[PDB]
């Protein structure tokens, strides 16, 4: 519900003097947004759901190729009509057999033949559509207020601390104004519009593994099929029957079912988790405008922390050009601002490392409290520092 | 009126049991005990964490 | 005022014990029992014979 630790993270500084920012959210991604004199926040799309799909086609892999039939017709006696031609009970196909006296017929030459095999379906590689009013989005907003390695990922704690929220967006009401206590509030106006990938892609279902295939690769494929009825067409895949037999028996070999035909075209179509009635879009995106002139700082009237500060371990690389670390405050005093900055060389006057966790501060007055901090240090070597003078501690770092 | 097998490709099932030997950053690689016997098929990877 | 190992390349000894599971032509492949445990390193090949 927040960005830290995710690999699909993007940092943003809307504009210059901007109280709002335009953004793009997608499936498993997150976004951290920074704005002068205001808390940092993380907008993140949690879930994509249809709270109403519909089937379109249904290719089968099959069984029933058991019953047989062979309506025989002697030479010059014309064609052969199998009674199993009145109802789709079976699939019939005519042929001719060289015969005569040898096998009960009076003259010698080609005789008619019209056999039939039965058809019902087994494993239906079902597929459906995705209309662009049942689409609801679930966006989660976090606030980079005080935290600890611990509480940073606990949704509960955070909500409790009024430093998080999870609301939904719908075509009905594409916006929302999430209130975050004394931090004011953030109001997104996400626009359900998405491509993202256009509905143009079909919803491929295969046994258990659902996928998203191209309308055509799907529709224009070679396999038996059925729309929304128990009636099947093109069952011709009941092939390899025409051993070009005798009037007695026309081998109706069930065509070997080779899931390779499907599997082979795996990578092409994107995979997607699908429950009986739902399709979580990861396929999908959302253009939002994070208006936040109502987002406001807190604990700005407090004094600076003036007591020792100890590191609780080597800062870590987020893989985003920023590092994380957790402090501990020897301080007995209450909620004070944490004096941490990034200095290019010991005892420089002006900072150089921008803090992601802007305006940090010891949340409680209960001495030895922990403080989580994410900051982007400058490239090359630099120093992280907390406190000043002879209280001040430091730890070096080298970005690349 | 005596053939012999040569190969045997499979279509399969057993993809049920799991394992995930974790190793912290700078702590090196991870060795899963399920690497002593073909009991399982192992493959390494890395995860962003801390 | 605490390092940790990561890898370990070797220069080696034990290349003493041997094994040669034989299989006649058309009798297929050869499976050496010394393939159950990393007790040994096995590798297949073929020999012209009769």
């Amino acid at each position: 519900f927040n960005c830290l630790g995710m690999s699909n993270r993007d940092f943003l500084e809307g504009v210059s003097g901007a109280t709002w920012v335009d953004l793009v959210l997608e499936g498993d991604s997150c976004v951290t947004i920074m704005s002068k004199d205001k808390p940092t926040i993380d907008v993140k799309m949690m879930n994509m759901e249809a709270a109403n799909l519909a089937e379109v086609r249904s290719y089968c892999y099959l069984a029933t190729v058991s019953d047989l039939s062979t309506k025989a017709a002697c030479p010059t006696m014309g064609e052969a009509h199998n009674d199993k031609r009145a109802d789709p009970a079976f699939v019939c196909r005519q042929g001719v057999v060289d015969r005569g006296w040898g096998n009960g017929c009076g003259l010698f030459g080609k005789g008619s033949i019209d056999t039939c095999a039965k058809f019902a379906c087994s494993t239906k590689a079902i597929g459906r559509t995705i209309l662009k009013e049942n689409i609801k989005y679930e966006v989660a907003i976090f606030v980079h207020g005080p935290t600890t390695v611990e509480s940073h990922g606990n949704y509960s704690t955070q909500v409790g601390a009024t430093q998080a929220g999870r609301f939904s967006i719908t075509p009905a009401a594409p916006s929302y104004t999430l209130k975050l206590g004394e931090y004011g509030e953030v109001t997104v106006d996400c626009e359900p519009r998405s491509g993202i990938d256009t509905n143009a892609y079909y919803v491929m279902t295969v046994g258990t593994k659902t996928f998203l295939v191209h309308r055509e690769w799907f529709m224009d494929l070679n396999l038996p099929w059925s729309s929304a009825g128990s009636t099947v067409w093109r069952n011709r895949e009941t092939l390899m029957e025409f051993e070009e037999p005798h009037a007695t028996k026309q081998s109706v070999i069930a065509l070997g079912s080779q899931e390779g035909a499907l599997h082979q075209a795996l990578a092409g179509a994107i995979p997607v988790e699908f429950s009986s009635n739902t399709v979580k879009l990861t396929s999908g995106h959302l253009k939002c405008r994070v208006k936040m002139e109502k987002l406001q700082l807190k604990g700005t009237t407090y004094g600076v922390c003036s007591k020792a500060f100890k590191f609780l371990g080597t800062p870590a690389d987020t893989g985003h050009g920023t590092v994380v670390l957790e402090l501990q405050y020897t301080g007995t005093d209450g909620p004070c601002k944490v004096p941490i900055s990034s200095v290019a060389s010991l005892n420089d006057l002006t900072p150089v490392g921008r803090l992601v966790t802007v305006n940090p501060f010891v949340s409680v007055a209960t001495a030895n409290a922990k403080v989580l901090i994410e900051l982007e240090p400058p490239f090359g070597d630099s120093y992280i520092v907390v406190g000043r003078g002879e209280q001040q501690i430091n730890h070096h770092w080298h970005k690349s």
Side-chain angles (χ1 to χ4, degrees), chain A residues 277-295:
Chain A
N277 304 300
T278 327
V279 178
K280 289 177 184 173
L281 301 183
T282 173
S283 290
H285 305 300
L286 171 64
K287 199 296 162 152
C288 313
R289 161 164 290 236
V290 191
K291 303 194 176 191
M292 57 189 114
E293 195 168 307
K294 291 291 182 173
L295 180 43

Side-chain angles (χ1 to χ4, degrees), chain A residues 56 128-132 194-204 212-220 281 283:
Chain A
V56 183
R128 320 89 176 308
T129 34
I130 304 174
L131 314 171
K132 294 180 176 180
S194 62
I196 57 176
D197 294 316
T198 300
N199 48 23
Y201 315 96
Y202 261 136
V203 191
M204 190 77 174
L212 201 69
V213 296
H214 282 293
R215 294 276 156 162
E216 298 70 34
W217 180 86
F218 173 67
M219 197 65 110
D220 309 62
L281 301 183
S283 290

Side-chain angles (χ1 to χ4, degrees), chain A residues 302-351:
Chain A
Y302 302 173
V304 179
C305 293
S306 301
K307 200 69 72 70
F309 255 124
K310 171 64 178 176
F311 291 118
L312 295 187
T314 293
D317 176 41
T318 65
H320 297 307
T322 53
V323 307
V324 197
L325 65 69
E326 183 174 47
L327 268 35
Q328 178 111 73
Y329 192 49
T330 57
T332 54
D333 50 6
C336 50
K337 305 185 164 195
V338 176
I340 174 178
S341 35
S342 176
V343 172
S345 286
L346 263 55
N347 85 295
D348 281 38
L349 293 178
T350 64

